[PDB]
Amino acid sequence: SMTSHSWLCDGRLLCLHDPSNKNNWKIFRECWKQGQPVLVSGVHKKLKSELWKPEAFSQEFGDQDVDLVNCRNCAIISDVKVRDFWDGFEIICKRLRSEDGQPMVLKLKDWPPGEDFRDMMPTRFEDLMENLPLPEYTKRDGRLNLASRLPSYFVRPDLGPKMYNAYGLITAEDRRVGTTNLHLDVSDAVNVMVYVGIPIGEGAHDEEVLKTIDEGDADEVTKERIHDHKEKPGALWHIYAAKDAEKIRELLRKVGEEQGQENPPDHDPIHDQSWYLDQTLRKRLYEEYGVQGWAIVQFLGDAVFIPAGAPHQVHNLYSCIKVAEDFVSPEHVKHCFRLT
Ligand SMILES: CNCc1ccncc1
Ligand SMILES: [Cl-]
Ligand SMILES: [Cl-]
Ligand SMILES: [Cl-]
Numbered sequence: 001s002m003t004s005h006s007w008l009c010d011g012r013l014l015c016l017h018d019p020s021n022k023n024n025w026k027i028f029r030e031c032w033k034q035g036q037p038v039l040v041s042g043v044h045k046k047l048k049s050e051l052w053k054p055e056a057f058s059q060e061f062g063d064q065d066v067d068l069v070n071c072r073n074c075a076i077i078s079d080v081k082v083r084d085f086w087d088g089f090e091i092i093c094k095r096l097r098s099e100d101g102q103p104m105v106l107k108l109k110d111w112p113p114g115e116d117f118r119d120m121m122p123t124r125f126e127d128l129m130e131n132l133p134l135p136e137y138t139k140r141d142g143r144l145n146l147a148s149r150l151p152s153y154f155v156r157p158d159l160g161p162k163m164y165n166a167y168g169l170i171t172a173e174d175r176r177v178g179t180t181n182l183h184l185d186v187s188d189a190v191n192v193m194v195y196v197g198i199p200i201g202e203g204a205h206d207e208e209v210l211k212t213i214d215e216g217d218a219d220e221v222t223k224e225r226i227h228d229h230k231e232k233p234g235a236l237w238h239i240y241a242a243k244d245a246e247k248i249r250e251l252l253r254k255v256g257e258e259q260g261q262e263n264p265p266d267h268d269p270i271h272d273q274s275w276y277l278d279q280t281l282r283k284r285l286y287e288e289y290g291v292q293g294w295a296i297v298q299f300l301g302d303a304v305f306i307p308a309g310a311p312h313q314v315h316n317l318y319s320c321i322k323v324a325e326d327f328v329s330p331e332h333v334k335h336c337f338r339l340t
């Protein structure tokens, strides 16, 4: 039967089932006040699906200049055309190649650039903002969004949304690599998976995707969404409570030292955005520091709510289009305050 919600991560993660249910706030707010992330499924069904395809982005915007990142070695590919990224999104034999002759795993950097999303893509902007879940929190003028209401004593988020476009990681070696490394944001955010691209030509790597989710520490209820409902999995997240950020810094300082980095004892390895916590680092965090995280698989249409100050990392399983909006909830406004 249709139900209001369910639990993931063995009861530690709320999953809301209907993105436009006017009563969601009653379940949401209790979980949110405790510093937990929240998942809302089904947002894809509310969107105009023709607006969120890689072929449309290539056709409409393909002549713009951009930089890309090689996810495997963090190298920048400077001043290429945006079509060079999009035309390889699903067709592997069209991807830019590394010196070694392999197709590259690429991320499109800062596109649309800065705050231009609304000006460049006015129809996409309308379609996203009108269909965000928890609208009193997430809309620019929502009754519980303080972004437009705070003085300069608080860091205000840039006008959004922001897009995250990147290929899926492929090999066993790629399992230890991040699409986006561990970092934190001083505002809350909602991140929506608007498109998942399962490739062709080398499209058959369905079994390395299961070993990544399994080793990623994903829960048994999550593994059932694949095998039983045939939903398309985009990305594996790890999120940590804001209260655990300093223990995470202590671990990454210890590991930097062991790997012979030379860092001052105050340096911030989370702000550096230089680490991805692989299965080894996540076990060590748990055992040596007492810190447990939320391992989340974001499927097509899943909205991930990320609390202000919560460290998080993302590993694309397949090619993804994500769109995120920043907001400032009253629950987490401490995280953006400039004093004490
Ligand atoms: C896939 N999204 C990448 C991302 C970057 C920063 N924060 C959250 C997500
Ligand atoms: Cl548009
Ligand atoms: Cl709401
Ligand atoms: Cl990064």
Ligand SMILES: [Cl-]
Binding pocket: 035, 242, 308, 309, 331, 332
């Ligand atoms: Cl908090």
Ligand SMILES: [Mn+2]
Binding pocket: 183, 184, 185, 312
């Ligand atoms: Mn982030």
